[PDB]
């Protein structure tokens, strides 16, 4: 009853920028959409911003060196694009250094890093000028993209363009959920559309530089299960995975929008204006891996509400994490089997970020997450059977290196495996970091 990964695995952990640098207004470093977005009422449990968050912007060497106490090879990260280009057109060299120091340490401790292009936090000057709404966003993209890959690539080995194309889109300009914080649907597809397009122009200015680090975009996906056999609730189910699955994998692998979803939308597309000759064409563009971040699944029964999808989630209260998210292992082998099936065909999969909130106490100076593990452990053996069998997992990213800022929930959720005291901003890693320390040694539990 042993799980032994391949020899090659990709044993990480990953982070973002704003969830835990810090210094919000330093080293030139402008503003955010998120730090707009946190300032509004009731956006985010405590009204917590990332303000300081787990000041990695100081603590980067400790962090690095803390990574390859625990024994990680590889470490995935997301640069501040506010940090860069903090205004129309300038490039900041003091952000531009913060980075180059931080692959300093990561090459000095024999890691492998992974640069995230974008992680949600979008400049606010760009916001301004209509954000992910506006095509001339994806040429600021342009812009920032080519300084980094210029500045680096020749030490970056493996490039993440999108982080999650569906949250910066349906959350942030849709449901009013993440920055900046619209409720407008036909915005939202707008916003899509153009993120994904700037994964397809990041790997132009990939394929036109000649780099030679692997490349690819990320995208949550969640497996979905009808509520019960009825008709409509099976239909319900299928509209969810076409709303946060297929929309953005369809284009990346088929070069086209899920038709049943462009035909529930309707009005919403206006006709699909948005979408430009040879747009598509640009989205279509795999790359080496593809990048997927998972943590639950979905329960999905119909209704005749005035929402979206009309749809809705049944709350499993069973195994929970301290988000409410349901704990179901099965399903995660079942999304990666699926994922395989259609749009990957066989390219190399690499699970970017799983993880899971659990309330967190300090006894004896040590942090027993029993569950946070219970939890890790069975998602690997999920990952195990999927290769086994065939699938083309490379590698895992245990999501949140570090306790962090955790978007909407604030500071109140941690998913990190090591304790970030908030008060005193020491690490302290927690029993799950130790596990995965012997875990990564014997390859396997
Ligand atoms: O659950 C919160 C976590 O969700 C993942 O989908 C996001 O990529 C992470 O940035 C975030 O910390």
């Known amino acids: 009853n042993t799980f032994i990964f391949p020899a090659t695995f990709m044993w990480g952990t990953s982070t973002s920028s704003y969830q835990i640098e810090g210094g919000t207004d330093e080293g030139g470093r402008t503003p955010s959409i998120w730090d707009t977005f946190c300032q509004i009422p009731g956006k985010v449990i405590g009204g917590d911003c990332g303000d300081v968050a787990c000041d990695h912007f100081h603590h980067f060497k400790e962090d690095v060196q803390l990574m390859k ?24 060299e003091e952000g531009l250094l913060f980075y180059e120091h931080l692959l300093d340490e990561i090459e000095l401790a024999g890691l ?10 979008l400049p606010q000057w760009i916001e301004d000028e209509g954000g992910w ?10 812009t920032y993209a080519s300084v980094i890959m210029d500045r680096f690539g020749e030490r970056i ?4 363009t999108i982080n999650e194309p569906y949250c910066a889109s349906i959350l942030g300009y849709g449901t009013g959920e993440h920055a900046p914080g619209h409720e ?45 056999e ?119 999969i690499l699970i970017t970020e799983n993880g899971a909130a659990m309330r967190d106490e300090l006894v004896n100076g040590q942090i027993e997450d029993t569950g946070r593990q219970r939890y890790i452990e069975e998602h690997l053996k999920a990952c195990h059977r999927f290769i086994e069998e065939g699938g083309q997992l490379k590698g895992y990213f245990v999501w949140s290196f570090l306790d962090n800022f955790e978007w909407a929930w604030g500071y109140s959720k941690r998913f990190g495996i090591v304790h970030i005291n908030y008060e005193t901003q020491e690490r302290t890693p927690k029993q799950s970091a130790l596990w995965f320390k012997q875990m990564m040694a014997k390859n396997g539990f």
């Open 69 to 92: 106490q625990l024994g990680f090879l590889h470490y995935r990260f997301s640069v501040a694009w506010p940090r860069i280009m903090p205004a129309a057109g300038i490039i900041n």
């Open 230 to 348: 009825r008709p409509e609730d099976v239909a319900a189910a299928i509209r969810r995975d076409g709303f946060i699955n297929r929309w953005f994998a369809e284009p990346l692998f088929n070069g086209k929008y899920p038709e049943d979803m462009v035909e529930w939308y309707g009005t919403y597309l206006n006709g699909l204006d948005f979408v430009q000759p040879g747009d598509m064409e640009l989205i279509q563009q795999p790359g080496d891996f593809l990048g997927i971040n998972y943590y639950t699944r979905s329960i999905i029964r119909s209704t005749n509400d005035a929402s979206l999808l009309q749809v809705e989630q049944v709350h499993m209260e069973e195994p929970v994490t301290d988000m409410g998210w349901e704990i179901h292992p099965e399903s995660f082998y079942k999304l990666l089997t699926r994922i395989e099936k259609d749009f990957s065909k066989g390219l190399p």
């Open 184 to 228: 407008n649907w036909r915005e939202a597809f707008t916003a899509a559309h153009h993120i994904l397009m700037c994964h397809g122009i990041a790997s132009n200015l990939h394929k036109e530089k000649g780099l030679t680090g692997k490349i690819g975009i990320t995208l949550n996906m969640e497996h979905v299960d009808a509520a019960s």
């Open 112 to 121: 492998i890093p992974m640069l995230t292009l974008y992680h949600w936090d």
């Open 157 to 160: 080995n493996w490039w993440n």
């Open 133 to 142: 709404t506006q095509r001339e966003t994806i040429q600021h993209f342009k």
